[PDB]
């Protein structure tokens, strides 16, 4: 044999069995991958975790608490043995309070709800770093989700600064994470039909060259795995596009 | 005179060093109105003023402070006279704590004193749009100035991050100014010795200083195809007055790089 | 006080009025500029259409595949300012692609001979522009020349993009060359505007569908630009290229300035 | 067994430090089924590849021969065998003449130096993918190899703007091969000591060659988070094996950085 095999990883992010961290679980542990798993409030999470190809420990973890950032590490070394360590970590988590969303008035947006905004969705992945690189082998990855901010949009409002701002976090992290020889990157997806899109959220499908199932996070998973996996070694503080390669198309 | 008639807002000035300095000195040169807004220090700010070439009335802005944001229009219509709007705004400010610089490790950075960099250093870019859109005439310009953060480097750590966020709120700022008629631009300036400069990123280099900075200074200068000099600020004075005049109208929710080209080239 | 006051202009790439080249010229005179213009092929009718321009310029012949027209051009020019005079500005304002390689045309079927005909006048000529004005420049000076963002792929402009992509590479390499002069250069990405190469070269190799082809873009690039755009509006691309060519943005080099109204920042 | 079962065609071996060496050798070991392509000294090349773990046949391509490229499909076939077809296609070949590289000034290249440059090294990715597309499987990959070109730099010159080219040319041949169900990408290496980088880039370097290439090898090492080894080729054909396998499918007309993240960093 499997892409994963023996390779220790930790993925966050599960709310339900649509979360692009649920399936990105899911092909991690097909391929051989033993893992370790965070929720957040709704722990509602262990029996979504429990439709997994294989059990795997269900650690609670809050990137705003810095008391759970404080022993989330040893608190994963309990789970997979001490002497253990991680060769993978998924960083699959963000949020912005509707005021900085949708329809609402970009300027309406008062700063402590982008402030919270940006705080779980680009900084906890430094944060998610700095508790887990003391545990990484060399050769691991840390891996975040990311939607292409480079150009502004209806709606993401937010959020795509939020993202900018996660795109020179993980810049930094790989500055970081190369000192225990460690990759750091984003693999930037398209559109996926999860609890966060309908939730708090064609042309994508026309532009890509291979077209683009916005039902279907798979083709995300699979290119989260191979960044997890050491067929990406020399690639770091960077960004794949899991986007049928829309993003290189004008129309 | 490149600015003829034109009234202006330019945030930014604490020394005269101040890139909003050079910016405030250049568009009165070139024959502009200004409005001038300080944060904090207002009387030394008003002595600084004083020496650039015509007189200005200068408000105070916090842009933290909400209360300062909600009077900011009426203030600057007082000062400009009623039936009177603005045909530019300069966006000159930053802020980002000690932690989040210099060798201060990048990780130990509390959130608190990020979040307040960001707010400071890019949210106050929409925040003044938004309070000033009011009284913009069509055809007018928002600019505020900008470090390329496209790539990560040495000691610009958490200001790096908060710069990212500024060029996508510059985007949406765009879509927003829109409305009005009105173009907004950030001009991404190479490096300049300004109080910024001295007290933030020097004081957070530490011992590291004088190596990383004159590292700094000789690539820049040899990247730059044209050369670069960090003790003038007045090409990036000029960039900053192109992009308020009329002779860049079709361009917006866009970077100016006024870096003597050196983002151009890798080596 | 002309933006453009006592500087002396080369200007090539006007055929029509409707030329991009043709309102950089009216706009640059109209600042004070003294210009010299460049003309390719149908020098005649180049002649009457400069007629229209504000003041009289002196036009020179300048095929950019032609050697002995490019080994002879700076001599020509200081003919044309007089003796002891250099240039301040060069623009670039020239393009071509065979039909092969544009529009519905498949793009695996365009032969080399004909995208490297189409690389050579759009992208590899300014470089030769450069190489032959850079020693009548004045320091201080700016060499311009005409870009299509072609970051992303797109129907229709097909190897006009790969002749674009390598434009966007030589300019960054000519401003190294251009700094050892004092000169800085730039290249505008302008957004569509209704010119005979818009007609002729893009909607001719349409086939039927260009009408709405064009008349869709014309909508579309409108729509995702914040302030707008009118595409049969050639002075804000005009402007823009005169504040290059000005002292204002005496900082910036090997660089991309976008006229398109802040459509390429805008995704929907 | 990444590509277990995979039948991929592999241009541009010459030496044993070549990137494709170093692909097809990766390839084979993750299980693939190989048809090789070489240029001009072919009996040599096949001496390379006598060095690879497995048999391979030896096909002669000419990127620049019109005859060659007619033929190619054909003779694959006979290779593959009637009825199967390619998985994969390597696009690992380039060439630039001596004036178009190096202290050679800029300046000075003929166009026609240039054009055959920008025919052997962008324009046929588009007519190997033309040539090779009616004979892929759907879920395929074709993979060229890219040194990224966005910003200038000493010694590459017009390479640099072929690259440019092919990137451009990149994009749009994701999109014919979609059409096929096949994806198209580039991957941007970090330096890599090859016969091209001493023949051709320290070739037109002069006396400044040692000096450059010290340069190369050491500042590419710092630059990169992970570091840089100049002398292996592994992780950039792994990284190549990545695009070619299934573990990428919904990547196309992109490019991927095997260049020790380098490209993100600014010092
Ligand atoms: N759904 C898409 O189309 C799409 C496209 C591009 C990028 N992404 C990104 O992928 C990631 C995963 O989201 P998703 O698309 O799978 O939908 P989702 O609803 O499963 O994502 C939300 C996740 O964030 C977690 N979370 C929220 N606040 C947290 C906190 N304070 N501490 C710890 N965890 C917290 C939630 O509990 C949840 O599992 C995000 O970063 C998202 O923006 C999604
Ligand atoms: N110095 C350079 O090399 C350089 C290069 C590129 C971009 N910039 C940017 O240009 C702008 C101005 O910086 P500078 O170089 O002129 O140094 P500076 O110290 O002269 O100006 C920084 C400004 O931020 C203001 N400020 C801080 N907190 C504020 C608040 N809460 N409310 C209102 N104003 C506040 C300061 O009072 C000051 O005037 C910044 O955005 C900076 O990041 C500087
Ligand atoms: N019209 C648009 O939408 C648009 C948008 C962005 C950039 N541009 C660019 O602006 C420039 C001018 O194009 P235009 O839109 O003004 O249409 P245009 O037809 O008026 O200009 C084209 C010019 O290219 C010149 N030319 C062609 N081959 C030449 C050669 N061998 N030697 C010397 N000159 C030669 C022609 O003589 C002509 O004057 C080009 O570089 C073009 O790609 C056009
Ligand atoms: N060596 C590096 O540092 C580096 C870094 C990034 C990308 N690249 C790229 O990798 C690829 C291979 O280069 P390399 O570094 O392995 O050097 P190399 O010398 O080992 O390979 C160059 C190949 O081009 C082939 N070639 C030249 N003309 C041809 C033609 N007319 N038809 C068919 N094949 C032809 C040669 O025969 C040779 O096998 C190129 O695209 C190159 O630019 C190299
Ligand atoms: C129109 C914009 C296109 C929408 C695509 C998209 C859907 C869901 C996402 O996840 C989130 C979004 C907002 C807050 C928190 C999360 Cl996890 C996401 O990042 C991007
Ligand atoms: C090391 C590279 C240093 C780059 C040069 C530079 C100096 C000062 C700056 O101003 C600030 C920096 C940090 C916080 C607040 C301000 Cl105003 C700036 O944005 C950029
Ligand atoms: C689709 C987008 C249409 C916009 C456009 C129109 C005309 C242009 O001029 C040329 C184009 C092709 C060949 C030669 C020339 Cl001069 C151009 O560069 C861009
Ligand atoms: C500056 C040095 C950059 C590293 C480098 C070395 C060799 C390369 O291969 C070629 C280069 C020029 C012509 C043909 C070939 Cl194959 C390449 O693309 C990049």
Redesign the interface.
């Known amino acids: 044999?499997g892409?994963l095999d023996g390779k220790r990883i930790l993925v966050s992010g599960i709310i339900t069995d649509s979360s692009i961290a649920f399936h990105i679980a899911r092909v991690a542990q097909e391929q051989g991958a033993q893992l370790v798993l965070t929720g957040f409030d709704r722990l509602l999470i262990q029996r979504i975790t429990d439709r997994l190809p294989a059990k795997a420990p269900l650690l609670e973890l809050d990137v705003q608490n810095e008391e759970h950032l404080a022993s989330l590490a040893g608190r994963v070394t309990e789970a997979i043995g001490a002497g253990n360590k991680l060769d993978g970590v998924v960083h699959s988590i963000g949020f912005m309070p509707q005021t900085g969303m949708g329809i609402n008035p970009?300027?309406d947006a008062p700063?402590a709800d982008?402030?919270k905004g940006?705080?779980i969705s680009?900084?906890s992945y430094?944060?998610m770093?700095?508790a887990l690189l003391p545990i990484m082998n060399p050769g691991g990855s840390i891996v975040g989700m990311d939607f292409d901010?480079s150009?502004?949009?209806?709606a993401y409002?937010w959020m795509?600064?939020?993202?900018?701002?996660l795109?020179?976090?993980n810049?930094?992290?790989?500055?970081?994470?190369?000192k225990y020889?460690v990759?750091?990157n984003l693999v930037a997806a398209?559109p996926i039909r999860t609890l966060a899109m309908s939730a708090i959220v064609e042309?994508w499908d026309q532009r890509?060259?291979?077209?683009?199932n916005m039902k279907d996070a798979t083709?995300?998973a699979?290119?989260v795995?191979?960044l997890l996996?050491?067929?990406?070694?020399?690639?770091?503080?960077?960004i794949?596009?899991?986007?049928?390669?829309a993003?290189?198309?004008?129309?």
Not at 151 to 154: D, G, I, S
Not at 160 to 165: G, Y
Not at 247 to 251: E, K, M
């Open positions: 044999t892409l970009f300027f700063y982008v402030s940006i705080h680009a900084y430094a944060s770093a700095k901010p150009r502004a949009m209806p409002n795509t600064v939020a993202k900018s701002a795109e020179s976090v810049r930094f992290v790989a500055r970081e994470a190369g020889g990759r750091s398209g042309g890509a060259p291979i077209g683009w083709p995300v699979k290119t795995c191979a996996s050491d067929w990406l070694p020399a690639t770091t503080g960077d794949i596009y899991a986007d049928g390669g993003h290189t198309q004008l129309l």
